[PDB]
C-alpha cells in the first residue's frame, strides 16, 4: 500500500524474494528487491521477453518472475560500480552548495531502474516523466571527468543526456514516481 | 663547361630539396601504408646521387682541400652512398625496416643548406659580418652562464624545500605488492604523511609512498626534487610556464603552504619573466649593431570617370562586406543539407559573377598590360580565379574556400591610416620574408632529423611518419605540452638512452623559444623605428570659500631626511587621508565572502560608512574651493574626476540601500560588482601611477590598429571554420559506436584518475568506471556551429592554451588535411600577430622617453655618459712596505690563480646541497662535516685579506663586507651545529651555503653586469607591478561576488575557486601565467541543467554567469597578458644597454675604465678623490695601451689635455669624474656620437683651447691608441 519505505510486510505489501511461493493468488502488488518502487502489476503490464500478461495468472508462463529478478540483480551490480566511484570521489562533501552525495545516489538509482524497466508507474500521488531523472543526475551529482585515451572528451563530464539540439521531455512522459526526499 | 654553366647550377640547388623529400619518406610505417614508396624512393635516390658525385669528381679530378664547401659536398655524397647501400639491404631479405640501422640517415637532411647557397657578400664585407656574429656570440654566452646560475640556484633550493612527490592517497585494501588504478582516489591526490604539514586523506583512505609499494621511476614519472639532477630538470620545465601550477598544487598537498607560495611565485617572476627578457634584449642589441655596421660601412572613354568615382569604389566595398557577412551567416540550424544546387551558393555565384564583371571592366578600361602591373590587381586576379573555381559544384566548401574568405582583405582601403600602419609594421618584405623562410626550413630539417632518429622504436608514436614528427616539433616550438612530447619519448626509448634524448629536446627547446621568438620581436621593432638617415635629416631640419581652498591646498612638511620630506610632500594632507581611507576600505573588502556579506555583518560595514563619510567631505571641499568644470583648476578635469565621482555615487547608492537579498542576474548584483572599483582611485591619488597610466595610453591608436588586424584574421578563419566544420566535430560518447543510429542505451565509461602516474594494468583488470547514457555531442569548450562560437574558439587558440585539444579533435573528427587550418592560424596569429603588440608597446615606451628620435650612435653615447657617472675610483689601498709580512700577504692574496681557486671553492661548497640535508639519513653527517672544513678555509682567506691591508680599507669594499658577514654566520653555525645536532642547525647550514653561493656574482665580471641589469629592472618597474596588483584586486573582488558559489567543474576545484579574495587572487595569478584560463571560464559559464538555480539569492544558487564570464575573463587576459606584461620587457631592454658593456673600438670600454682606475689610484695615494692640476701632466703620461697619449708626435694632444683641465677650475684641483669625462669626449667621434645641442658647445670649447694653446706657443717663442687616432681625425677635419 505505502511506498516501500521500511519493513518486509508492515506497509501492507511485500517483495518477490522467492520464485516459487507465487503460483496463484489474486491481487498484484508484490514489490521488487532492489528497484523497490516497481511492483509485479506494472511489470507484467509492460514488456517481458519470455512471455506476457494473463498467462502469468492462468503458472504456465511464470518464467517472467525469474526474468524480472535477473534484471533487478543486473541493475544492482551496475549501481555498486557507481557508488564505489562516488565513495572514491574525495570532494563529495564540498563540490556544490545545494547538492549532496545522498541525493545523487538516490536519483542515479531511480535512473538505473527506469533504464532496466521502461514501464509506467501510478497510484503514488507524486508522478514525473522518467526522462527528468537524467536532468536530476546532471544537476545533483559531481563533475566526474571521463578518461581521454582514444576519444578526446573536450571538457564534457561522464554523465550527460542531450546533444546537437535534440528534443527531450517530448510529452512521451513515461509516468515514473517521484522517489526522492527533496 | 659542364660545371660552369648557370643552367645546371640552379638544378643542382633545386634537386637538394627533392633529396630531403625522399629521406622524409624512408620510414617502416609509411612503407607499410604505401608499398610503392619503397621502390620509387630507391630509384629517386639513385639517379640523384649521380648528379652530386658527377660534380664532386669533375671539380677535383679535372678542374681541381681547404674549401669548406668541397669537404661538405664530399661528406654529403658519402651520406647518399651509405643511404643507398643501407636501402638495397633493407629492401632485400638482409635486414628489416624496424632495425636501428636507419640512424645512419640522420646527417642527410642538412643538404637543405645547398638549396640556398646565399652566403656570399650580402651587402656587407666578411670581416664586418664576423665582427657582428662574434659580438652577439659573447653576449649569448654571457646570458647562458647567467641562466645556468639561476637554474642551479633554484635546483639547490628545490632539493632543500621539497622532496619526493610519492605520498598519494590510497584505498586501504591495497597490499604492498598490488598497487593498481583501482587502489587510488578518483580525483588523484597527494598527502603529507605528517599531520598538519599538508593535506591528509578522509576516513576509509590512508597514504604511503607508492615507490615503496614496488612502483618504478617510469611509473611514478620523472618530475621531482629528490636530487639536483631531477631538480634542475623540474626547475627548467616549471620556468617554461608549462604545468607549473600542478607542481605548486602537488607541493601544497605534500608540504607546508608558505614555502610553495614563496618558491613557485618567485621562480615565475625571475626565471620566466625577467630572465627571458634579457635574451630578447641581446637580439635587439644585435639588430642595433647591424644598423651601426650598415651606417658605418658607407564608349571606352568612360574609363576617365567610372574607374575613378567614389560611387564605384564604395559600391564594390559595400558589395564585399555584404558578400562576407552572407557567406559567414550559414550557421548549423539542423541536420538537413542539400549542397549540389542550394541557397548560400546562389548568393556566392551571384557575387562571384559581380567580381568577374568588375575585373573585366577594369581590364577593358585600363588595358591588361597596365592592369597586371599593380600588386593589388595581381591579388584580385588570384581571388577572381580562385573563387571562380570554388563555386564549381564539386569544389564548393572545399580547400578552395580560402579564396572566398580572403575577399575581406580588399576592405583595407577603407582608411589610409590602416594602410600606412600595415606598410610601416611589416616594412620591406625582405626582412620578415627571410625570417619566416628560415623558421620553416629549420623546422623541416629538425622534424626530418627527429623522424630518422625515432621512427623505428615501435613503442613510440608521434615520430612514426613525417607529418606526425612535424606536428611534434611544432608543438615543442609553440610551448604547449612540450614536456609531454618529451616524456612520451623518454618512457619509450628506454632508461639507457633517456639522458641523450633529454639533452636533444632541451637544446631544441632552448633555441626554438629563446632565439626564434626573439628574432620576430627584434624584426618588428626594427621596422617600427625610422631609418638612421631619416632621423638624422629630422634632427638637422628641426633645429568664506577661500578657507575651504586653504584647507584643500594644505602645505607640506640632510639627504636621508630630505628624501623623507619629499615623500611626505608628494600629495596634499587631504589626499593622504583619502589614500588611507581607500586602503582600509580595500582591506575590509578582502574579508567579504558569499557566506559573510557587509549587508549582514556590521563589523565590515564600518569601513563602508567611513569611505562615504570622508569622500563626501572631500568632494564637497574640492567643489567649494575650485568648482565642477568651470576653470582649469576644477575637480572634473578629465576621466579621473569622472571616475572618482562615479565611485562615490555607486558607493553612496549601495550604502543607503543595503539589499537584504540579491538575485544572481540583477541590478543589485551589478551594483555590488560596480562597488569593486575602489582600488582604481589610488591611480588618481598617487602621481607616479597617473604617469604610468598616461604613458600606457600614449599607444592607444597603435594598439587599436593591431586589434583591428587580429579581429580581421579571426573573422576569416571563423567564416571558413563555420563553412567547413558546422555539424561535424560531433560524435558518440561511446568510443565503440561509429553511427548516430547506435547512440542509444547505456555503456560503461572509464573515469580519469590522473594523466601522470602511468601504471600498467594487471592482465584481467578493468579501469575504474560507471554506467552512463551514450549520446551524440559536441566538445564542451568549442563546437564550431556559428560565427560567435568559432570566434570564441579562435580567441582561445590565439593564446596557445588548449590549442592541441582543438588540433587533435579537428584531425580525428573532420579529417587529416584540416590540420593545415589550425597550424596556419597558430603561425599567423600567435607567432606573427601577437608579436605586433610586443613591438607596439616597446616602441611607444621608447617614444615616451624620447630615445626613438636618437641615432644608435647617440643612444650608445647616452648609455656611456650615465655609466661613467655611476663609476667611481677603486677602494683598494696601496700595498704596505713598513714590514715584509703584510707586503707578501698583499702579493699572495692578489695572485690571479688565488682569486680563481677561491671562486672554485664556493662552487665546491655549493655542491654539498646535492641531496636533502635532513637529520635521519646518515649521509647528512659527512656533508655537514665537510661544510665545517670549507668554513675554516674561508675564515683563513678573510684573515689573509685582513693581514694584507688595513681593516679600515678592507671594509670599504662591499664584496669584502658581504663575504665577512657570510663567514661570521658560517663560524656561528659551526659552534651551534656541534652544540645542538638538531634539524634547525642542518637547515641553518643549508642557508649559509646558499648565502655564500650568491658571492660568485661579485667575482665574474659579465655575471655582475647581468645581475645589476635584473636588480635595477625590479626597482624601475615597481609602480607598473603595483598598477597590475590594483587591477588584480578589482578583478578578485568582482570574481568573489560574481562566481563565488560556482559548482565544481573541469578546473574549478578545491585548489582553484573564487570562494574568498585570497583564493580569487591566486586563481588570477594562474591566469596571468596563462595556465588553462579557458577551461576555468567554461566552468564559470555553467547554467541549468548542470547546476541548481535559486529564485532570489545569489549565495543560495551554485550556477555561474554566462555573459559575466565572457566579459570577466577575456578582458582580464587581454589587458594583463597582451598589454601590461610587455612593459616589463621594455624596462629590461632599457636597462640592458645601460649596465651591460663589452669591448668595442668606438667608445671608452670597461677595460679602458679599469686601466684608468688603476693608474688614477697610484697618483691619488691618500684616496682624497680630487687631485691638484700639477699632477695631471704626470697622470696622462702613465696611460700606455689603448688610452696612450704619446709624449712624442702627439704633443698637441698632450698640451690640449693639460690645458683643458687647467682651464676647467682656473688651476686648483680636479675630481676623478672630470678627467674621466675629458677622456670620453677625447676618444669618441663627436660629429656622430653627440646630439646637435651639446656638439656646438663642445666644438666651441675645443676651438677656444686651440686658440689659447696657439697663443701660448707663440708667446713662449716670442720671449726668445683611440685618443691619438681621434685627435688625428679632428686635426685632419679642422
Ligand atoms: C565587415 C564584416 C562584418 C561581419 C559581421 C558578422 C555578423 C554575422 C551574422 C551571422 C548571424 O546572424 O549569426 C547567426 C547566429 C544565430 O545563432 P543560432 O542560430 O545558433 O541561435 C542560437 C544563438 N546562441 C546559441 C548564441 C544563443 O548568430 C550568431 O551567433 C552571430 C553572432 C553575432 C556576431 C558576433 C560577433 C561579431 C563581431 C564581428 C566584428 C565586426
Ligand atoms: C644559438 C646560436 C647563436 C645565434 C646567434 C644569433 C644570430 C643572429 C642572426 C644574424 C643575422 C645576420 C643578418 C645580417 C644581414 C643584413 O645585412 O641584413 C639584416 C637582415 C635583413 O636585411 P634586409 O636585406 O632584409 O634589409 C635590411 C635593411 N635594408 C632593406 C636597407 C637592406 O635581417 C635578417 O634577415 C634577420 C633574420 C635573419 C635570419 C637568418 C639567419 C639566422 C641565423 C641563426 C643563427
Ligand atoms: C646519436 C647516436 C645514437 C646511437 C644509439 C643507437 C643504439 C640503439 O640501439 O638505439 C638506441 C635506441 C633504440 O631504441 P630501443 O632499443 O628501445 O628499440 C629497439 C630495441 N632493440 C634494441 C632490441 C632493437 O634508440 C634511441 O633512441 C637511440 C638514439 C637516441 C639518442 C641519440 C641522441 C644523439 C643526439 C645528441 C645531439 C646533441
Ligand atoms: C620589487 C621589490 C624591489 C624593491 C622595491 C622597493 C621600491 C621602493 C620605492 C621605489 C622608489 O623609487 O621610491 C621613490 C618614490 C618616488 O617619490 P619622488 O617623486 O619623491 O621620487 C620619484 C621616484 N622615481 C624617480 C624613482 C620615480 O617614493 C615615493 O614617494 C613612493 C610612495 C610610496 C608609496 C605610495 C603608494 C603606495 C600605496 C599602494 C600600496 C598598496 C597597493 C597594493
Ligand atoms: C586601466 C586603468 C584605469 C585606471 C583608472 C582610470 C583613471 C586614471 C587617471 O585618472 O589617471 C590620470 C590620467 C591623467 O594623467 P596626466 O598625467 O595627464 O594628468 C595631468 C594632466 N594635465 C597635465 C593636463 C594637468 O587620466 C587620464 O585621462 C589618462 C588618460 C586616459 C585614461 C583612460 C582609461 C580608460 C579605461
Ligand atoms: C581592453 C580589453 C577589451 C576587450 C573586451 C572584450 C569584452 C567581451 C565582450 C563580450 C560580450 C558578450 C555579450 C553577450 O554575450 O551578450 C549576452 C547574451 C545573452 O546571453 P543569455 O544569458 O541570454 O543566454 C543564455 C545562454 N545560452 C543562450 C548560450 C543558452 O549572450 C548570448 O546569448 C549571445 C551568444 C553569443 C555571444 C557572442 C560570443 C562571444 C563573441 C566574442 C567575440 C570575440 C572577442 C574578442 C575580442 C578581441 C580583442 C583583441
Ligand atoms: C602539399 C601538401 C599535401 C600533402 C598532404 C599533407 C597532409 C596529409 C596527411 C594524410 C595522412 C595523415 C597521416 O596518416 O598522418 C597522421 C597525422 C597525425 O594523425 P594522428 O596520429 O594525430 O591521428 O596527420 C597529420 O598530422 C596530417 C596533417 C598535416 C599537418 C601539417 C603538415 C604541413 C606540412 C609542411 C608544411 C610546412 C610548409
Ligand atoms: C662544480 C659544481 C658545478 C659547477 C658548474 C657550473 C654551472 C654553472 C654555474 C656557474 C656560474 C659561474 C661560474 C664561473 C666561475 C667563476 C670563475 C671566476 O670567478 O673567475 C674569475 C675570472 C677571472 O677574472 P678575475 O677573477 O681576475 O676578476 C676579479 C674581479 N675584481 C677585479 C673585482 C677582483 O673572471 C671571469
Ligand atoms: C577596469 C575594470 C576592472 C573591473 C571590472 C570587472 C569586469 C567584470 C565584468 C562583469 C560584467 C557582468 C555583470 C553581471 C550582471 O549583473 O550582468 C547583468 C548586467 C546588468 O544587469 P541588468 O541591466 O539586467 O539590470 C537591469 C537593472 N537596471 C535598469 C538598473 C539596469 O549587464 C550589463 O549591462 C553589464 C554591465 C557592464 C559594465 C561592467 C563593469 C565594468 C565597467 C567599466 C568601468 C570603467 C572603468 C575603467
Ligand atoms: C579501511 O577502510 C574501511 C572503510 O571505512 C575502514 O573501516 C571503518 O572503520 C571505522 C572505525 O572502526 C568504522 O566506524 C565504526 O566502526 C565500529 C565497529 O568497527 C562501529 O561500532 C561504529 O558504529 C562505526 O561504524 C567503519 O564502519 C569502518 N568501515 C566499515 C566498512 O564499516 C578501515 O578502518 C579503513 N582503514 C582505516 C584507514 O581506518
Ligand atoms: C575503457 O578501458 C578499457 C580497458 O579496461 C578499454 O578496453 C580495451 O579496449 C582496447 C580497444 O582498443 C582493447 O585492445 C583492450 O584489450 C581492452 N582492454 C581489456 C582489458 O580488455 C575500453 O576500450 C575503454 N572503453 C571506454 C568506453 O573508454
Ligand atoms: C482478482 O482477480 C481479478 C481477475 O480479473 C483481477 O482483475 C484482480 O486484480 C484480482 N484482485 C486483486 C486485488 O488484484
Ligand atoms: C597481492 O600480491 C600477490 C603477488 O605478489 C598476489 O598473489 C595476491 O593475489 C595479491 N592480492 C591481492 C588482494 O591483490
Author numbering:
A (entry chain B): 192 to 249, 259 to 382
B (entry chain A): 31 to 94, 103 to 336, 373 to 617, 846 to 859, 872 to 1578, 1589 to 1602
Pull text from the paper.
Here, we report the cryo-EM structure of human NALCN in complex with FAM155A at an overall resolution of 3.1 Å. Three glycosylation sites (Asn210, Asn216, and Asn1064) were identified on NALCN and one glycosylation site (Asn217) on FAM155A. FAM155A sits above the pore domain of repeat IV of NALCN and forms extensive interactions with the ECLI, ECLIII, and ECLIV of NALCN. When the four VSDs are superimposed relative to An1 and CTC, all R4 residues are above the occluding residues on S2, reminiscent of up or depolarized states. Moreover, the S4-5I linker unexpectedly forms a flexible loop instead of a juxtamembrane helix as seen in the other three repeats of NALCN and other Nav/Cav structures. Notably, the unique structure of S4-5I and S5I results in a cavity that accommodates a lipid, which may contribute to the regulation of NALCN. We have assigned a total of ten lipid molecules in the structure. The key residues in the SF of NALCN responsible for the ion selectivity are E280/E554/K1115/E1389 (EEKE), distinct from DEKA in Nav channels and EEEE/EEDD in Cav channels. Surprisingly, although NALCN is supposed to conduct a “leak” current, the intracellular gate is closed, even more tightly than the closed Cav1.1. Notably, the lower gate is fully blocked by the III-IV linker.
NALCN consists of a single polypeptide chain of 24 transmembrane helices (TM) that form four homologous functional repeats connected by intracellular linkers. NALCN is associated with several auxiliary subunits, including UNC80, UNC79, and FAM155A (Family with sequence similarity 155, member A). Together, they form a large protein complex termed the NALCN channelosome. In addition to its role in regulating neuronal excitability, NALCN is also important in many fundamental physiological processes, such as motor function, pain sensitivity and circadian rhythm.
